[PDB]
Amino acid sequence: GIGKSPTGIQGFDELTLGGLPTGRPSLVCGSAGCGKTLFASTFLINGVR
Amino acid sequence: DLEGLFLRLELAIDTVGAKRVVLDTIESLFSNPAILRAEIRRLFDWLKERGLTTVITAERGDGALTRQGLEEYVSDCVILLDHRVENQISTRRLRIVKYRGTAHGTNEYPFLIDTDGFSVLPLLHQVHEERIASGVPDLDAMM
Amino acid sequence: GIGKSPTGIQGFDELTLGGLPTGRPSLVCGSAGCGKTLFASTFLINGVRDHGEPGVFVTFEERPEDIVNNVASLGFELDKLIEEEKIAIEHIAVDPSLEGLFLRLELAIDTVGAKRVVLDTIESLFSAFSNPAILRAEIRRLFDWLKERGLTTVITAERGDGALTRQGLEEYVSDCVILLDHRVENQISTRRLRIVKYRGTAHGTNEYPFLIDTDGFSVLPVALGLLHQVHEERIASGVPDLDAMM
Amino acid sequence: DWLKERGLTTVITAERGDGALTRQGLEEYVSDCVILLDHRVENQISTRRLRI
Amino acid sequence: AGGGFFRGSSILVSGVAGAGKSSLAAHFAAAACARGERAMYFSFEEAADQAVRNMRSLGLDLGRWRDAGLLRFMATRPTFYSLEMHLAVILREVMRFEPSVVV
Ligand SMILES: Nc1ncnc2c1ncn2[C@@H]1O[C@H](COP(=O)(O)OP(=O)(O)O)[C@@H](O)[C@H]1O
Ligand SMILES: Nc1ncnc2c1ncn2[C@@H]1O[C@H](COP(=O)(O)OP(=O)(O)O)[C@@H](O)[C@H]1O
Ligand SMILES: Nc1ncnc2c1ncn2[C@@H]1O[C@H](COP(=O)(O)OP(=O)(O)O)[C@@H](O)[C@H]1O
Ligand SMILES: [Mg+2]
Ligand SMILES: [Mg+2]
Ligand SMILES: [Mg+2]
C-alpha cells in the first residue's frame, strides 16, 4: 500500500483508510467559512499531541 | 524573488524538527498560467525532497476547485469542503475528489465544527439469546 | 473494417467492440478524480500482460516513483515490468530555465518494442503558455508523428473550466473521445463513463457506470437479458406440501 | 492593519452582483467575520435573510 | 357476432398476473401460423424458449411454427433501450418479416 499520516479526525481517518498521504501535497479546497485553515491547524496540532 | 520563502522555510522546519507542514493563504502570495503553475510544482517538489507531509489551503470563490482554476491539478491529494444552506438550515460537508494510491470514501460526509473541533459519524452484530421483561406480565408471557 | 486494440477492460471492450482504435489517438477527457491516469495505466499494463503489446508512458507532471506506487497499491505489478525492460516511464518538465519528444520516444520505443503510448498531461506545454498561436499545430504534429509510427495513443486531458476539454480543439483532433464523470446525487457519488465519439465503429452511446476498486477499473458488463436458461427439471422448496401443490 | 494596530472594531460594507456571488471575492478572504444579507422573493412576497 | 375480430384491428387483453393473457396471445399466433399467415411475438419480459416451453403445457407447439419460419419471436427488455429505440426496432423487424399477426 502507501503510507498514511493520521489527521486525528476520527471518521475522516476511517474514510481515508488511516489518514492523509505521507510526505505529499494535499489541498483543502472550499469557499470562505468551510473550515480549511482549521482543518490544517488540527492536522498539525493532532500530529503534535 | 522566490529564494526568501525557502530561506524562511528551512529555519522553521529544522528549528522544531518537524515532519508536518501547513501552508495557508498561498493564493494571495501567488496573486497567465506559466508563472503560477511552474512555481507551484517547484515548491511541492522541494517539500517532497525534504520529506515533509504537506497540507495547502485553497480557496475557490469563483471556480469549482480553485480561484485560478489550474492550481488544483498539480496536487496529489484533494479534499473539498462545502457549506450548503438548503431551505434555511446549513450543513457542512467534506468530500475527497482525488486521493491517488489508495481507496477512500467518494461519498460526501457531514462534519461539525463544534467547540471540540471537526466531528464526523462514519453492518451486523452478534445476537443475544436471553429474554427481557416488558414490565407488563401478560405481554411478556404472550411469547 | 476498423482496427481495434483491447484495453483489457471487460465491458468497456464490449462498448467499443474491440477496444480503442489501434494505431489511432484517443482522448480520455475527465476532471480531477475521475480516473484518467488509472485508465491509461490499465491500458498499457493489461496490453503488456494479456495482448503482449509493449508501451511507453510519458508523464508531464509527476514522478515515475509516484506512478509506480499509485498503480501498484491496486495490484498491478508495474515495478517488475519496468525492470523487465518491457515498459518505460519518461518524465518531462516545463519552464526549464519539438524533436526532443520524438527522440526520447524513439529511444523508449526501440528499447521496449513499444506499440502503445500514453501521454499524461500534454496539457502542460500548451496551457503553461498560450502565447504561440500554433498550439493546434503542435498537437496535430505529435498526433501525426504517433500515427506515422503506427502507435496506439491514449492522451489524457483536463476538463475543469468546462466543455469536454479546456483546450477546446483537442476533442476535435481526437478520433475516440471518452468522457469520465463522478457525480454526487443526494450525498452519494456515482462514477460514469461515456463514448462521446468514435470514428468508424458502433459504440455505447449512453452513460455506462464504472467503478474503481482493488480489482481495478471495472465496468459492469452489458445485454444480459432474455438469454435465459430453460430447465425442465424441478427444484425442491423444502416444504413438501408446497411442492406437491404444483 | 493600521486599524488593527489602533484597536478599532471596523464594519466594512461592500456589495455584490455582476455575475459573481461577490463583487471581487478576494475581500472575503481578507475579512475575519463575513455577514451576508439577502432580499429574496418567494411567490410575490419577499423576505430578509441574514447569514454568517 | 361475425365470428372473429376484424383482420386489421387492435385487440387489448387486460388482466392481472397469472390470468392467461400471454396464453391467449400465443393462441392467436398459433392459429395464424396454422392458417399459413406470418406471426411475430414481442416478449418484453419472457424468453423465447421459455415462453414456448410454457405453452407446451397448453398443447401448443409454438416451437414447431418457429422452426418452420412463420413465427418470429423477439425477446427484449424495456430498460435496455430508449422508448424511441424500442419503437424503431419493433417497426424494423415487422417491416422485414411482413407479418399478418403481431403480439
Ligand atoms: N472556536 C470555534 N468555535 C466554533 N467554530 C469555529 C471556532 N473556530 C473556528 N471555527 C469555525 O471554523 C471555520 C474556520 O474558518 P477559516 O479557516 O478562517 O476559513 P478559511 O480558512 O476557509 O478561509 C469558521 O467558519 C468557523 O465557523
Ligand atoms: N486502490 C484504489 N482503490 C480504489 N480507488 C483508487 C485506488 N487507487 C486510486 N483510486 C482512485 O483513482 C482516482 C484518481 O485517479 P487518477 O486518474 O490517478 O487521478 P485523476 O483522476 O485526477 O487523473 C481517485 O479518485 C481514487 O478513488
Ligand atoms: N395445464 C394447465 N392447467 C391449469 N392452469 C395452467 C395450465 N397451464 C398453465 N396454467 C396457468 O396459466 C397461467 C400462465 O398464463 P400466462 O399466459 O403466463 O399469463 P400471463 O403471462 O398473463 O401471466 C399460470 O397461472 C398457470 O398456472
Ligand atoms: Mg482564515
Ligand atoms: Mg493522475
Ligand atoms: Mg404476461
What values do phi and psi take at C194, rounded to 5? -150, 140
CB contact (8 A) between residue D29 and residue A32: yes
**Residue spans of beta strands (DSSP E) within D1-52:** 36-42, 45-51
Q: Which residues line ligand 1 (CB under 6 A)?
A: A 30, 32-38; B 57, 113, 115
For residue B91, the SS3 value is strand
C-alpha cell at D36: 451576508
B116 class by beta-carbon count within 10 Å (0-12 exposed, 13-18 middle, 19+ buried): exposed
**Euclidean distance between CA atoms C165 and D5, whole angstroms:** 49
Q: Residue E40 to residues C1, E56, E59, E82: CA-CA distances in angstroms?
A: 33, 18, 19, 21
In the sheet that B53-57 helps form, which strands lie side by side, from edge to edge? B20-23, B53-57, A25-29, B77-84, B91-99, B109-114, B117-120
CB-based contact B95:B108 (threshold 8 Å): yes
In the sheet that C208-213 helps form, which strands lie side by side, from edge to edge? C87-91, C55-59, C116-120, C152-156, C25-30, C176-185, C188-197, C208-213, C216-219
User: What is the CA(B100)–ligand 2 centre distance, in A?
Assistant: 5
CA torsion B54-B64-B61-B101 (nearest 10°) is: -10
CB atoms within 10 A of CB E94: 15
**Euclidean distance between CA atoms C185 and B33, whole angstroms:** 33
Establish if D28 touches chain A: CB-CB under 8 angstroms: yes
Task: Tell me the residue type at A31.
Answer: S
Q: How far is A19 from chain C (nearest CA, A)?
A: 16
C-alpha cell at D23: 463583487
CB contact (8 A) between residue A1 and residue B55: no
Q: How far is B23 from chain A (nearest CA, A)?
A: 8
CA torsion through residues B69, B73, B76, B77, sign? positive
CA-nearest residue, atom 8 of ligand 1:
A38
C-alpha cell at C242: 408446497
**Euclidean distance between CA atoms C218 and E71, whole angstroms:** 40
Ligand 2 lined by C75 (C-beta under 6 Å): no
Q: How far is D51 from chain B (nearest CA, A)?
A: 10
Q: What is the CA radius of gyration of chain A?
A: 11
Residue in C28, C36, C38, C62 to alter for ligand 2 test, most ligand atoms within 8 A of Cβ: C38
C-alpha cell at A4: 498514511
Assign 3-class secondary structure to B20-88.
Answer: EEEECCHHHHHCCHHHHHHHHHHHHHHHHHHCCEEEEECCCCCCCCCCCCCCHHHCCEEEEEEEECCCC
Range of the domain at C30: 4-219
Q: What b/e readout covers B2-19, taking b as 16+ CB neighbours within 10 angstroms?
A: eeeeeeebeeebeeeeee
CA-nearest residue, atom 14 of ligand 1:
A35
Report how far Cα E75 is from the mean position of its chain's Cα atoms: 10
Establish if A2 touches chain C: CB-CB under 8 angstroms: yes
CB-based contact A9:A46 (threshold 8 Å): yes
Q: Which atom of ligand 2 is nearest to the CA of B101?
A: 8
Q: Residue A30 to residues B67, C39, C121: CA-CA distances in angstroms?
A: 10, 28, 25
- Let me know the angle formed at the C-alpha of B52 by B55 and A7, rounded to the nearest 5 degrees: 50
Chain C positions in Cβ-Cβ contact with residue A2 (cut-off 8 Å): 69, 73
C-alpha cell at C246: 404444483
C-alpha cell at B8: 524562511
Residues 6+ positions from D3 with CB-CB distance below 8 Å: D10
Residue in A34, A38, A39, A43 to alter for ligand 1 test, most ligand atoms within 8 A of Cβ: A38
C211 class by beta-carbon count within 10 Å (0-12 exposed, 13-18 middle, 19+ buried): middle
Strands C25-30, C55-59: parallel, antiparallel or unpaired by DSSP? Answer: unpaired
Establish if C191 touches chain B: CB-CB under 8 angstroms: yes
Q: Is C95 left (phi over 0), alpha (psi -120 to 50) or beta?
A: left
Which one-letter DSSP state was computed for residue D17?
A: B
Task: Tell me the residue type at D14.
Answer: A
Q: Residue E51 to residues B80, C161, D11, E23, E100: CA-CA distances in angstroms?
A: 54, 53, 78, 9, 20
Cell 481515508 belongs to A16
**Euclidean distance between CA atoms C67 and C215, whole angstroms:** 17
CA-nearest residue, atom 18 of ligand 1:
A37
**Euclidean distance between CA atoms E91 and B120, whole angstroms:** 56
Helices and strands per DSSP (H, E), number in chain A: 2, 3
CB atoms within 10 A of CB C195: 20
Q: What residues have their beta carbon closer than 5 A to ion ligand 5?
A: C 37
CA torsion through residues C142, C143, C144, C150, sign? positive
Which one-letter DSSP state was computed for residue E35?
A: H
For residue B122, the SS3 value is coil
Q: Residue C137 to residues C169, C170, D26: CA-CA distances in angstroms?
A: 11, 11, 38
Ligand 2 lined by C34 (C-beta under 6 Å): yes
Structure determined via: X-ray
CA torsion through residues C127, C132, C135, C138, sign? negative
Which one-letter DSSP state was computed for residue D20?
A: B
Establish if A17 touches chain D: CB-CB under 8 angstroms: no
**Euclidean distance between CA atoms A14 and A31, whole angstroms:** 25
Q: What b/e readout covers A16-42, taking b as 16+ CB neighbours within 10 angstroms?
A: bebbbbbbbbbbbbbbbbbbbeebbeb
Q: What b/e readout covers E25-48, taking b as 16+ CB neighbours within 10 angstroms?
A: bbbbbbebbeeeebbbbbbeebbb
B 60-119 near A (Cβ less than 8 A) = 60-61, 65-66, 71-72, 74-83, 92, 94, 96-97, 99-105, 109, 111, 113, 117-119
CB-based contact B65:B72 (threshold 8 Å): yes
Task: Tell me the residue type at E42.
Answer: F
Cell 498539480 belongs to B74
- Let me know the angle formed at the C-alpha of B108 by B106 and B111, rounded to the nearest 5 degrees: 130
Q: Residue E97 to residues C227, E10, E72: CA-CA distances in angstroms?
A: 22, 19, 8
C-alpha cell at B117: 473541533
CB-based contact B95:B107 (threshold 8 Å): yes
**Euclidean distance between CA atoms E73 and E41, whole angstroms:** 5
Assign 3-class secondary structure to chain C.
Answer: CCCCECCCCCCHHHHHCCCECCCCEEEEEECCCCCHHHHHHHHHHHHHHCCCCCEEEEECCCCHHHHHHHHHCCCCCHHHHHHCCCEEEEECCCCCCCHHHHHHHHHHHHHHCCCEEEEECCHHHHHHCCCCCCHHHHHHHHHHHHHHHCCEEEEECCCCCCCCCCCCCHHHHCCEEEEEEEEEECCEEEEEEEEEECCCCCCCCCCEEEEEECCEEEECCCCCCCCCCCCCCCCCCCCHHHHHHC
Considering only alpha carbons, which residue of chain C is nearest residue A1?
C73
**Euclidean distance between CA atoms A18 and A25, whole angstroms:** 17
For residue E79, the SS3 value is helix
C24 class by beta-carbon count within 10 Å (0-12 exposed, 13-18 middle, 19+ buried): buried
Greatest Cα pair distance, chain B, in angstroms, is 86
User: Which of C8, C6, C28, C21 has its CA nearest to residue C202?
Assistant: C21
**Euclidean distance between CA atoms B123 and C118, whole angstroms:** 41
**Euclidean distance between CA atoms A26 and A21, whole angstroms:** 8
CB contact (8 A) between residue B81 and residue A34: yes
Q: Give the best residue of D16, D24, D27, D29 to mutate against chain B (max B CB count within 10 A).
A: D29
For residue E98, the SS3 value is coil
For residue E29, the SS3 value is helix
**Euclidean distance between CA atoms C7 and C28, whole angstroms:** 13
User: Which of C158, C165, C141 has its CA nearest to residue C31?
Assistant: C158
**Euclidean distance between CA atoms E12 and E25, whole angstroms:** 10
CB-based contact C216:C37 (threshold 8 Å): no
Which one-letter DSSP state was computed for residue E78?
A: G
Cell 473494417 belongs to C1
Stated resolution in angstroms? 3.5
User: What is the CA(E19)–ligand 3 centre distance, in A?
Assistant: 7
For residue A47, the SS3 value is helix
Residues pairing with E102 in the sheet: E40
**Euclidean distance between CA atoms A18 and C24, whole angstroms:** 42
User: Which of B57, B54, B58, B56 has its CA nearest to residue B21?
Assistant: B54
Considering only alpha carbons, which residue of chain B is nearest residue C121?
B73
What values do phi and psi take at C181, rounded to 5? -140, 155
Q: What is the CA radius of gyration of chain E?
A: 14
Establish if D34 touches chain A: CB-CB under 8 angstroms: yes
CA-nearest residue, atom 26 of ligand 1:
A33
Residues 6+ positions from A42 with CB-CB distance below 8 Å: A7, A8, A9, B117, B118
Strands D45-51, E39-43: parallel, antiparallel or unpaired by DSSP? Answer: unpaired
User: What is the CA(B2)–ligand 3 centre distance, in A?
Assistant: 83
CATH number of the domain enclosing C119: 3.40.50.300
